[PDB]
Design a protein around this nucleic acid. Structure first.
Ligand code: CL
Length: 674
DNA sequence: GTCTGCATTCCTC
DNA sequence: GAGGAATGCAGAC
């Protein structure tokens, strides 16, 4: 037998990897259950012709935020040990268990939509940091999903990321020698007959290639050829994007192609200089000598990928003059500092506001230097210019020990790890005029790029410090997705809903609402929506919220869950398909009176609730059902108590009790009190 | 309070 | 109008 672990942010992310495997593997036997209270498993017997395989996948939901926060050891330490120095967490890590320890096979990130603008690089630190470890980094995204005006669920026009973002994965792969890729799955809203922006999309960009790659990695087989097919699709996405943008201020596909095939490097393109680097700065952001610094950059710079990306190049042939102008502007007279600035090499200049008016850091700026390092290499000389307001404590730490600031803040960690020179021309909150700093960070950057955490083997123990909201979620998901409907995968019975979308089925169609907001005017997005069709004359939609403790259930949460479903019913489903037949745009609106809507709050309670406490929770939340869960340690069991508010919820409880049976799931790990 | 994930409006060209 | 600049809310701690 072979055992693999799937460490995920939650049970849904873990199960997405299992669904990808089950899309290519058709198993002879499937068994589900728990290896511990927190860790569900799926066991499969399958064959490749005459060759049988027996695999078990043990799932670890909820990552640690430190070394012993939830789990006794942090699986993420395996990434820090290989050079992942940014505080970055993927969605899933898949490991192989051998000789009492875990070995990472890959890191996977799932994204619902191809993000655009600075949101495209906001989390680029993940791909950069995990990419430099040698462990494969797979970014999977749906192409396309429409952004909506939440007021009326009307679709906004499609926006695409700058072609340099998808390209960065390709360049990061080449620079490191590791497999870092962006893969695209056909979204339900990919409808090219209704949107002219998709006219030239090559449908061969859509990735069985991801399931093939995962299975070949699980089998310890050669994946070089599958990797090339995926890289080819990533490149064809850059082709689609660059051929749809204007060539005057952006790299053309033939320029990207000449970099990809190794003819030229991104800084030695023969056409470099046809557009300059022109950073756009809002007039309200200006202070000190920022405008004059931007003029000096635009006097010497050559564009890198796009004229208005927040970075560009100062070629070594112009570096002396650029440095003389900066030194004259900021009164830098120190002979030794000027020599450091005048090193005879190309200089990447990155310009970022960094901070909002109250000195709180810009999230998108965290990915700017990782994006530059993925495109140009981490050893490229980077001059980072910051002009946003700094709180007094931040400039104080810059003057005492910049690494102290980098240790506590992700933005400062990105700046300090990747910049050779950090220049600040910042307003200081509480003071009338800007502060100027010129930090020679070369030696510090070099030290960070060699740093790795303590080498040590990891075997995460399946018993966490304590049981909390991740465990409540795993239990709720297992009961309503596998035990009560009698399913073994995500592709089964009514799909229901979660944070990523809501599906409602009938006798002929599956209707789906995509792009669900966290809140509506009177509603809150449920953690899970369960559809039950064999209980009442009308179908039931059970909306559930999961919390660590009963007092974490907010006032009117039960009513808000129902009102969220009522909000969706006020609009045509995003997409629909015939359960017998392809996804199309939603055509017909659904009727709420055709459904019974109930709400439920789930939590962990160690028998600290009286009849009056339960009465108070019902009054506060308005939930139709409360699900009180508690673990028993000897023998390990989850004891479930279903508390109905009314007669309708009581019928649901009796239904759950009657159907708490399964040929696939080991229900023996549960005890339903009533 | 701070830090980070999430995602929408603002502003320059 | 395109698309990067800029911005804040929320949850978790
Ligand atoms: Cl093309």
């Amino acid at each position: 037998m072979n055992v693999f672990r799937i460490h995920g942010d939650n049970i849904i992310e873990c199960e997405r990897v299992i669904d990808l495997i089950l899309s290519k593997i058709n198993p002879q036997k499937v068994k589900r259950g728990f290896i511990s209270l927190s860790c569900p498993f799926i066991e499969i017997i399958f064959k490749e012709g005459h060759d049988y395989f027996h695999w078990r996948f043990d799932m670890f939901p909820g990552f640690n935020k430190n070394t012993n926060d939830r789990w006794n050891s942090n699986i993420l330490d395996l990434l820090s040990q290989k050079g992942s120095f940014l505080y970055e967490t993927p969605d899933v890590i898949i490991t192989s268990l051998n000789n009492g320890k875990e070995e990472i096979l890959m890191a996977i990130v799932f994204c619902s939509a191809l993000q655009a603008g600075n949101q495209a690089w906001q989390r680029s630190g993940r791909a950069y940091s995990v990419g430099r470890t040698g462990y494969p980094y797979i970014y999977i995204v749906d192409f396309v999903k429409y952004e909506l005006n939440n007021s009326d669920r009307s679709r906004k026009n499609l926006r695409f990321p700058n072609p340099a973002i998808p390209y960065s994965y390709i360049s990061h792969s080449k620079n490191t020698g590791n497999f870092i890729v962006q893969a695209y799955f056909r979204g339900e809203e990919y409808q090219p007959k209704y949107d002219k922006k998709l006219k030239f999309f090559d449908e061969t960009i859509f990735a069985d290639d991801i399931a093939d790659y995962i299975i070949a990695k699980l089998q310890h087989r050669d994946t070089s050829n599958i990797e090339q097919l995926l890289i080819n699709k990533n490149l064809k996405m850059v082709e689609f994007l660059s051929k749809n943008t204007k060539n005057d201020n952006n790299f053309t596909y033939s320029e990207w192609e000449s970099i990809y095939n190794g003819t030229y490097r991104i800084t030695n393109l023969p056409s470099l200089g046809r557009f300059k680097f022109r950073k756009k700065i809002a007039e309200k952001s200006l202070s000190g000598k920022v405008k004059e610094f931007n003029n000096i950059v635009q006097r010497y710079s050559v564009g890198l990928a796009s004229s208005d990306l927040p970075f560009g190049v100062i070629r070594k042939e112009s570096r002396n003059d650029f440095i003389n102008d900066v030194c004259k502007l900021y009164n830098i007279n120190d002979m030794k500092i000027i020599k450091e600035l005048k090193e005879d090499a190309d200089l990447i200049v990155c310009m970022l506001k960094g901070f909002k008016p109250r000195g709180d850091d810009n999230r998108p700026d965290r990915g700017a230097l990782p994006l530059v390092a993925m495109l140009a290499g981490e050893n490229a000389q980077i001059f980072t210019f910051i002009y946003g307001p700094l709180i007094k404590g931040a400039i104080n730490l810059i003057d005492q020990d910049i690494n102290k600031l980098a240790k506590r803040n992700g933005l400062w960690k990105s700046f300090v790890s990747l910049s050779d020179f950090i220049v600040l021309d910042c307003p200081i909150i509480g003071e009338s005029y800007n502060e100027f700093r010129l930090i020679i960070n070369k030696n510090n950057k070099e030290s960070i790029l060699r740093k790795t955490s303590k080498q040590q083997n990891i075997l995460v123990d399946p018993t966490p410090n304590h049981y909390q909201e991740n465990d409540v979620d795993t239990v709720i998901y297992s009961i309503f997705k596998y035990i009560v409907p009698n399913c073994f995968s995500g592709m089964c019975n009514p799909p229901g809903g979660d944070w990523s979308g809501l599906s409602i089925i009938d006798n002929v169609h599956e209707f789906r609402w995509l792009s669900l907001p966290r809140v509506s005017e009177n509603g809150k997005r449920p953690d899970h929506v369960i559809q039950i069709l064999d209980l009442f004359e009308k179908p039931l939609l059970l909306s559930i919220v999961s919390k660590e403790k009963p007092n974490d259930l907010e006032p009117k949460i039960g009513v808000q869950l129902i009102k969220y479903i009522e909000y969706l019913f006020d609009f045509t489903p995003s997409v629909q398909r015939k359960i017998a037949g392809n996804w199309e745009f939603g055509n017909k609106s659904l009727v709420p009176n055709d459904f019974i809507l109930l709400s439920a709050g789930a939590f962990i309670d160690y028998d600290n609730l009286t009849e009056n406490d339960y009465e108070k929770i019902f009054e506060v939340t308005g939930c139709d059902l409360l699900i009180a869960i508690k673990n028993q340690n000897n023998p390990q069991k989850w004891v479930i108590k279903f508390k109905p508010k009314n007669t309708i919820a009581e019928k649901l409880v009796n239904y759950i009790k009657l159907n708490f049976k399964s040929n696939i799931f080991d229900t023996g790990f549960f005890h339903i009190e009533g």
